[PDB]
């Protein structure tokens, strides 16, 4: 009821806020130790840090109190940084997955094109594409007044809402998965090809196995974190949604699962290896 929802949102906000900061703190301290590897991880922390601060705090206000009372220009501002970071936190995960393949397949021949000056071009490109897809959301949400209540629901018509909802699904979840899942298949195939190992103590038994286990962990959150959230919007449009207590608990659970992709990325990507531990 009114007790479970505020606590669950608060706990996820605390974990996400704390976790992304330590990754930034360790990367930032000292300086002059930033390469193509660390540049991409730095972008991942910044994009995921913003999402928790501008998505969790007020999305619980829909289910707690009556309407959006605090703020009038914020109903247009926050709904731009909700999808701006969500489109850049998922585009960098398809760039780490591709950078991680060039530095493994070619450790000697892939040092020319992995310079730090060449990593800032891709960082700028990622953020440039985020504004394009998240731009049309300034007119998507507008404050209104229903039953003398100040609220900001979606404002566009029904024919104009199907196109926008599908486009976000295709360009933020469906497309990055086909790139983050195909590359990790090639790294695991090359790492386990029929070639005589250098040694048995650590050549293939230990080193080649932990990389296989740790890659499979990363490929499993992205597929499952943002799936149920897009699995509810499809049911609303092309199916029947009873809007009852039976399916109400799934709506809140859908939001909660989506935040896991940002409260665990600073852990799996950074706070595992002894270099950051």
């Amino acid at each position: 009821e009114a007790v479970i929802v505020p606590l669950l949102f608060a706990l996820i906000f605390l974990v996400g806020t704390v976790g992304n900061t330590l990754v930034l703190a360790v990367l930032l301290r000292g300086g002059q130790a930033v390469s193509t590897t660390n540049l991409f991880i730095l972008n991942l922390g910044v994009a995921d840090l913003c999402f928790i601060l501008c998505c969790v705090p007020f999305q619980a206000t829909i289910y707690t109190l009556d309407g959006w009372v605090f703020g009038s220009l914020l109903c247009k501002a926050v709904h731009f940084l909700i999808f701006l970071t969500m489109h850049a936190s998922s585009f960098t995960l398809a760039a780490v997955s591709l950078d991680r393949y060039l530095a493994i397949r070619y450790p000697l021949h892939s040092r020319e094109l992995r310079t730090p000056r060449n990593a800032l071009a891709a960082i700028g490109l990622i953020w440039g594409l985020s504004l394009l897809f998240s731009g049309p959301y300034l007119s998507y949400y507008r404050q209104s007044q229903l039953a003398n209540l100040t609220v900001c629901h979606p404002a566009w018509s029904a024919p104009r809402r199907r196109a926008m909802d599908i486009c976000t699904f295709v360009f933020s979840y469906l497309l990055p998965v086909l790139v983050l899942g195909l590359t990790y298949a090639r790294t695991l195939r090359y790492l386990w090809r029929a070639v005589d190992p250098v040694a048995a103590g650590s050549g293939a038994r230990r080193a080649k196995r932990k990389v296989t286990r740790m890659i499979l962990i990363v490929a499993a959150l992205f597929c499952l974190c943002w799936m149920p959230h897009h699995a509810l919007i499809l049911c609303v449009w092309f199916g029947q949604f009873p809007l009852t207590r039976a399916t109400y608990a799934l709506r809140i659970l859908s939001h909660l699962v989506s935040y896991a992709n940002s409260c665990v990325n600073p852990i799996v990507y950074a706070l595992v290896s002894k270099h950051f531990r």
Partner: peptide, 16 residues
């Protein structure tokens, strides 16, 4: 349960 804001955020205008 379902409130005016919760249904408006999901179904949209008019019918909530």
């Amino acid at each position: 349960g379902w409130t005016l804001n919760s249904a408006g955020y999901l179904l949209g205008p008019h019918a909530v």
